[PDB]
């Protein structure tokens, strides 16, 4: 990154932002991941026991990626508007 | 050189302010122009305060 003495690029530019300690313990889940679990329920714990999310994740959301083609129930996760309708199209329910 | 810096402050209590310069020797009169406050989204009185 040394340019010969000219104030280098990573120093003539300003710093910005702060890191979130929350983002670390958060996860996303694809629709192609809902069949992967055993039991037809999707809790934070089943996800962890199917090795979908790491053992220290506290919050998870399901996003519209891939496809569900089996009835599932989903407890405690957040779900996107789009992913919601996909889960329902299969004949799955979204408790909390 | 001689022109100081000042802040003009909204009368709509929002906090929002503009900044400008002033010759205080020649024209020592608390400047009161009227500007658009975007926190209430209306033109109001603004009144010279100190930077």
């Amino acid at each position: 990154g040394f340019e010969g003495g000219q104030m280098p690029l990573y120093r003539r530019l300003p710093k910005f932002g702060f890191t979130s300690r929350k983002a670390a313990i958060t996860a996303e889940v694809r629709l192609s991941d809902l069949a992967k679990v055993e039991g037809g329920v999707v809790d934070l714990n089943t996800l962890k026991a199917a090795n979908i999310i790491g053992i220290q994740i506290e919050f998870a959301k399901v996003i519209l990626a891939g496809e569900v083609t089996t009835p599932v129930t989903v407890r405690g996760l957040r779900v996107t508007k789009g992913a919601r309708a996909a889960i329902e199209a299969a004949g799955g329910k979204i408790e909390e | 050189g001689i022109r100081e810096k000042i802040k003009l402050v909204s009368s709509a209590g929002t906090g929002h302010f503009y900044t400008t310069t002033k010759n205080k020797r020649t024209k020592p009169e608390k400047l009161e122009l009227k500007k658009f406050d975007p926190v209430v989204r209306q033109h109001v009185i603004y009144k010279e305060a100190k930077i």
């Binding site: 990154g1 340019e3 280098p8 690029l9 990573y10 120093r11 003539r12 530019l13 300003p14 710093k15 910005f16 932002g17 | 810096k5 900044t19 400008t20 310069t21």
Partner: protein, 64 residues
Amino acid sequence: PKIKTVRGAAKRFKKTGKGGFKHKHANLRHILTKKATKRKRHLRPKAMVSKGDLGLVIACLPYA
């Protein structure tokens, strides 16, 4: 040994979805009264690192 990241550089760049980098613009920290609102307004959203620089930047951020 693992390469060490250049820590100052990692506070001024985030990588984007096609492998570019975004940075804040210079000239917007102080001495603002004498600058025009137009100039300051355009200087407010984040930018993309240009092609000349982008070799220098990747060198500094190997784990980006």
